[PDB]
Amino acid sequence: SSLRPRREDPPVLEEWYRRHLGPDIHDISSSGVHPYSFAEIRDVCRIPAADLDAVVMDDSVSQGGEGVRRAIADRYAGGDADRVLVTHGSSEAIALTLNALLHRGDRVVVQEGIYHSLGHYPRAAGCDVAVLPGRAVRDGEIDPDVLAGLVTPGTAAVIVNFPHNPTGVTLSPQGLRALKERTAATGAVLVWDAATAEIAHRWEVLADPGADGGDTVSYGTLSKTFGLPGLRVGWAVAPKELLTATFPLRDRTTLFLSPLVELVAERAVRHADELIGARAAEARHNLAHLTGWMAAHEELVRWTPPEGGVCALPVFRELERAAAGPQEVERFCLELLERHRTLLVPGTAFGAPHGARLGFGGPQEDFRAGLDGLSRFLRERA
Amino acid sequence: SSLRPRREDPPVLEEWYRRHLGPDIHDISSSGVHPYSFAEIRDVCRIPAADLDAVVMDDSVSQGGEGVRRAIADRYAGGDADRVLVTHGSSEAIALTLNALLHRGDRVVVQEGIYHSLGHYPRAAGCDVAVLPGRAVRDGEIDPDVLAGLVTPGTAAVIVNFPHNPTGVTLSPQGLRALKERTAATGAVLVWDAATAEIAHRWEVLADPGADGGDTVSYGTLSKTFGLPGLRVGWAVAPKELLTATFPLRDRTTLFLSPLVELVAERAVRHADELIGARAAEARHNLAHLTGWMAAHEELVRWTPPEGGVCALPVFRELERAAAGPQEVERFCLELLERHRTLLVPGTAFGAPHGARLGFGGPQEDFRAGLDGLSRFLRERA
Ligand SMILES: Cc1ncc(COP(=O)(O)O)c(C=O)c1O
Ligand SMILES: Cc1ncc(COP(=O)(O)O)c(C=O)c1O
């Protein structure tokens, strides 16, 4: 038999979860807020059984159904439904638009430790990639001296995720304005993954640069702040010409979304403030508790507190002292899971060999139990 | 600004529908049976509102949820849920498995006029493609003399769709057995798109070669025979080793399906006979009527009757006589739509310059109206 499957290494993040997600664990590893049940969604978003029952299970359309596009456009595109592309999670919006955007040889600037798929597409397109160092982002701005050297005339795209999964670093409105001015000046396309945009702790929620109506591409999803990762709805906001250029790829991958899913997503987006607000309050409750926990453990752990989003990257001092290598953090996390039923994501998934992602957007009761597990574990090793 | 979207030609099929689908037309162009409403699905598939309400909108898993995988495996994989991959339509299953299966330089045999995405992936992978001529498939078998020259030791894959969209040609159980014997002998992977497998008119429904438990890849979908194109659920049946090799690609495109969608799909597959049977009876009603219509129009139209599925490819004699070129059939279909509100798909979408796809799986009332439109149109031109 000639069957010889092409093999590629899976991203560390997703493989970690395939191997270790399961029942009876304290999962304090997520970059999202814990999921709603469909009952809660129907309640909050005002979805009578009859409205679902009326949906004819027919084809939807290439760009996304008009109702859901409009709801998203009103919140993130200044009401221009023509600049919205509705997709199976933001994962699909990323795959579609970056395949259409990026060219072999293009100079592209990519945020250090960016979400795996955002780093994958420029590499795979054969772009000339320069990294934006994580240390250059501080106090709500990218160091203007760093931005000046990295983004210059001929720079094709600048690709960032703010608030950043997993560190929670983000920009202030002033920082975003300065970033947009540099990309506009050079003609670079700003590519802005706003997965956790709706939850901001230090400065205000960043207005979607997609709403400006220029040559920027931004992503959003219901997966991380809305409690709907299982709905599989995200979007890109971008010029119509880029969006339609994605259709041939969409034609041989997914075709279109379900009108039943699109109805639900439309109602969720219309009720975004209630869905997000309830989960954001719980996350901030957990965050206040996590901050106290971190102060109590400052000998064993250090961190930058998150400026946005619902996860952070604690760094374990014992891994800094012993100094690497990357495999040690994976062992650390495995042992923690084995001995204490507590799940983090090892920093190898994000280019941070000495850290792990700790999510605080899960349920408040389970959060304490996970922290107790981590506490016992750190004590045992010290 | 550097924004320069990469441009590719869209498949003719999907672009035709983007330009010409709409309200107030008689659509007799589809390769599928007309969609159920969600109300009907809940009724037939026994889905209480409470079962939907219980679904937590959390992550599903890379291979597809266990319940839906099992339901599909029982019907098409001889009960081996490990050999099933559940995907966003069969479109995604095709994209995922062919990306993992096909290698540059591989000799691949591809059915003439095959569904666009099935023809795209071997071309794009840089396979060495030989075409299986449509005229070689007759009376339920591929001409053994043709199969002998095309599929030889070192042939990597043979890619076919039976029943065939748009001609409705298919194989008998004997024809399928002979095809499988030739691929098994040479070590070629049979890739078997069974989108319309459940509706067979001349011989029995073909048992899924996926159920054999060898090195074959077969696709199915809820889109064409179940009345659920808008659910966006399909699958591949294939060796587990090929399926898991798709995970890295799935990790940067769709991640996984919705558990809410997976619940519905599981119940639909369990109630497949009722969902399919009702629509199959209506299609056969339309087919009996279409056959009489074709006899009444034998001066202007010829056809091979469909052996399976719910569409056929009538050939318009006036286009044969005047002899091409391909653009004339598109004009023909446009005029038909403009003047008579009746939609076909021009044969340019399927490599058949003188034909158009005529679907008989739509509602019986709308079917007559479409045929009257086509009749008036053919008379006008004669
Ligand atoms: C920053 C970022 N972008 C995009 C995604 C893709 O998620 P989805 O496809 O559920 O929208 C994720 C999820 O991990 C993420 O953390
Ligand atoms: C033969 C064949 N295979 C696959 C597909 C993909 O459909 P879906 O993604 O809805 O399963 C189609 C739909 O046009 C088809 O006709």
Side-chain angles (χ1 to χ4, degrees):
Chain A
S1 171
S2 73
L3 175 72
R4 215 194 340 123
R6 296 172 74 253
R7 287 275 170 184
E8 207 195 302
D9 288 308
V12 172
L13 175 62
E14 320 296 350
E15 190 55 29
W16 179 255
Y17 277 140
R18 272 189 291 273
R19 289 170 202 211
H20 299 120
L21 226 31
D24 290 300
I25 59 165
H26 307 298
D27 183 0
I28 51 161
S29 77
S30 176
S31 71
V33 300
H34 69 278
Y36 285 103
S37 70
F38 193 53
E40 299 172 299
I41 297 301
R42 300 210 294 117
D43 176 15
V44 176
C45 310
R46 313 311 293 134
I47 313 173
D51 288 9
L52 296 176
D53 284 353
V55 173
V56 181
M57 307 300 282
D58 202 354
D59 289 1
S60 190
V61 299
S62 292
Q63 210 179 321
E66 173 169 17
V68 63
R69 266 192 301 115
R70 239 92 138 111
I72 299 165
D74 284 355
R75 195 170 184 86
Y76 304 106
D80 191 358
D82 269 354
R83 287 176 42 104
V84 177
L85 171 68
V86 192
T87 56
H88 190 268
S90 63
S91 297
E92 187 189 15
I94 290 166
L96 285 177
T97 54
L98 292 189
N99 275 119
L101 181 73
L102 266 16
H103 305 74
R104 177 161 302 273
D106 277 352
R107 289 208 310 286
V108 171
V109 173
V110 182
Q111 181 184 34
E112 183 184 351
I114 201 170
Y115 179 69
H116 60 87
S117 82
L118 291 166
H120 170 274
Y121 286 107
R123 215 187 314 152
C127 304
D128 176 20
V129 172
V131 173
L132 164 70
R135 77 167 55 172
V137 194
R138 70 287 170 280
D139 303 317
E141 68 165 21
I142 301 165
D143 182 341
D145 280 350
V146 171
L147 201 53
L150 287 178
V151 3
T152 50
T155 294
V158 177
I159 306 181
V160 297
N161 170 44
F162 294 122
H164 172 75
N165 169 5
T167 64
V169 78
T170 192
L171 306 182
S172 66
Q174 189 172 321
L176 178 49
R177 193 170 73 244
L179 172 58
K180 282 152 137 192
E181 287 172 17
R182 180 98 296 252
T183 58
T186 59
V189 179
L190 179 63
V191 175
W192 177 266
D193 188 334
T196 56
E198 299 273 358
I199 300 181
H201 310 298
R202 187 167 164 194
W203 305 277
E204 65 200 42
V205 163
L206 301 173
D208 203 295
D212 291 356
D215 294 1
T216 60
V217 176
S218 48
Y219 307 116
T221 175
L222 303 183
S223 294
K224 303 295 170 193
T225 62
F226 286 78
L228 293 167
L231 191 57
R232 303 273 70 219
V233 174
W235 53 86
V237 177
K240 170 108 173 219
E241 67 163 322
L242 178 68
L243 303 182
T244 63
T246 76
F247 292 174
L249 181 53
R250 202 184 197 168
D251 288 341
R252 51 170 156 94
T253 50
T254 57
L255 293 177
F256 38 76
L257 305 180
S258 172
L260 190 67
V261 169
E262 291 183 318
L263 175 63
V264 176
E266 173 185 6
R267 307 273 170 100
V269 170
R270 294 305 186 184
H271 290 86
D273 293 320
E274 314 168 53
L275 293 173
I276 299 164
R279 288 291 195 264
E282 180 166 17
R284 293 188 179 114
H285 172 277
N286 293 336
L287 180 53
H289 188 258
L290 178 57
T291 306
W293 188 99
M294 289 284 161
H297 289 84
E298 62 181 1
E299 69 295 343
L300 303 168
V301 186
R302 67 168 181 95
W303 85 332
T304 310
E307 293 158 349
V310 297
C311 61
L313 191 83
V315 170
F316 302 102
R317 291 201 203 263
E318 129 213 6
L319 302 189
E320 276 185 318
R321 293 177 213 154
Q327 261 41 239
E328 192 49 56
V329 74
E330 291 172 352
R331 183 135 8 91
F332 181 106
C333 289
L334 265 145
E335 290 172 22
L336 175 64
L337 178 62
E338 262 154 36
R339 268 201 286 285
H340 295 282
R341 257 59 279 287
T342 295
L343 189 72
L344 300 172
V345 184
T348 49
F350 326 96
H354 304 131
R357 182 178 79 188
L358 193 162
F360 52 89
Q364 44 189 93
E365 45 269 273
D366 316 16
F367 190 63
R368 299 170 200 115
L371 288 190
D372 290 341
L374 178 53
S375 190
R376 284 187 284 262
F377 186 66
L378 290 167
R379 276 200 283 104
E380 285 168 355
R381 301 167 69 87
Chain B
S1 171
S2 73
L3 175 72
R4 215 194 340 123
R6 296 172 74 253
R7 287 275 170 184
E8 207 195 302
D9 288 308
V12 172
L13 175 62
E14 320 296 350
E15 190 55 29
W16 179 255
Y17 277 140
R18 272 189 291 273
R19 289 170 202 211
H20 299 120
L21 226 31
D24 290 300
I25 59 165
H26 307 298
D27 183 0
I28 51 161
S29 77
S30 176
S31 71
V33 300
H34 69 278
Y36 285 103
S37 70
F38 193 53
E40 299 172 299
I41 297 301
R42 300 210 294 117
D43 176 15
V44 176
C45 310
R46 313 311 293 134
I47 313 173
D51 288 9
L52 296 176
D53 284 353
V55 173
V56 181
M57 307 300 282
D58 202 354
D59 289 1
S60 190
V61 299
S62 292
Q63 210 179 321
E66 173 169 17
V68 63
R69 266 192 301 115
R70 239 92 138 111
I72 299 165
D74 284 355
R75 195 170 184 86
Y76 304 106
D80 191 358
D82 269 354
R83 287 176 42 104
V84 177
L85 171 68
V86 192
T87 56
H88 190 268
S90 63
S91 297
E92 187 189 15
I94 290 166
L96 285 177
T97 54
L98 292 189
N99 275 119
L101 181 73
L102 266 16
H103 305 74
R104 177 161 302 273
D106 277 352
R107 289 208 310 286
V108 171
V109 173
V110 182
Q111 181 184 34
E112 183 184 351
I114 201 170
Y115 179 69
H116 60 87
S117 82
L118 291 166
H120 170 274
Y121 286 107
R123 215 187 314 152
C127 304
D128 176 20
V129 172
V131 173
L132 164 70
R135 77 167 55 172
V137 194
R138 70 287 170 280
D139 303 317
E141 68 165 21
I142 301 165
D143 182 341
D145 280 350
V146 171
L147 201 53
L150 287 178
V151 3
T152 50
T155 294
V158 177
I159 306 181
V160 297
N161 170 44
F162 294 122
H164 172 75
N165 169 5
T167 64
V169 78
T170 192
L171 306 182
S172 66
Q174 189 172 321
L176 178 49
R177 193 170 73 244
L179 172 58
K180 282 152 137 192
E181 287 172 17
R182 180 98 296 252
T183 58
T186 59
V189 179
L190 179 63
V191 175
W192 177 266
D193 188 334
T196 56
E198 299 273 358
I199 300 181
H201 310 298
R202 187 167 164 194
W203 305 277
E204 65 200 42
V205 163
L206 301 173
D208 203 295
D212 291 356
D215 294 1
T216 60
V217 176
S218 48
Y219 307 116
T221 175
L222 303 183
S223 294
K224 303 295 170 193
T225 62
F226 286 78
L228 293 167
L231 191 57
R232 303 273 70 219
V233 174
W235 53 86
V237 177
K240 170 108 173 219
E241 67 163 322
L242 178 68
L243 303 182
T244 63
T246 76
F247 292 174
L249 181 53
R250 202 184 197 168
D251 288 341
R252 51 170 156 94
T253 50
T254 57
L255 293 177
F256 38 76
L257 305 180
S258 172
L260 190 67
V261 169
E262 291 183 318
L263 175 63
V264 176
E266 173 185 6
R267 307 273 170 100
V269 170
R270 294 305 186 184
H271 290 86
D273 293 320
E274 314 168 53
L275 293 173
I276 299 164
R279 288 291 195 264
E282 180 166 17
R284 293 188 179 114
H285 172 277
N286 293 336
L287 180 53
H289 188 258
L290 178 57
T291 306
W293 188 99
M294 289 284 161
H297 289 84
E298 62 181 1
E299 69 295 343
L300 303 168
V301 186
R302 67 168 181 95
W303 85 332
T304 310
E307 293 158 349
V310 297
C311 61
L313 191 83
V315 170
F316 302 102
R317 291 201 203 263
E318 129 213 6
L319 302 189
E320 276 185 318
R321 293 177 213 154
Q327 261 41 239
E328 192 49 56
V329 74
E330 291 172 352
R331 183 135 8 91
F332 181 106
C333 289
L334 265 145
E335 290 172 22
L336 175 64
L337 178 62
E338 262 154 36
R339 268 201 286 285
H340 295 282
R341 257 59 279 287
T342 295
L343 189 72
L344 300 172
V345 184
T348 49
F350 326 96
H354 304 131
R357 182 178 79 188
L358 193 162
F360 52 89
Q364 44 189 93
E365 45 269 273
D366 316 16
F367 190 63
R368 299 170 200 115
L371 288 190
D372 290 341
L374 178 53
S375 190
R376 284 187 284 262
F377 186 66
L378 290 167
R379 276 200 283 104
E380 285 168 355
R381 301 167 69 87

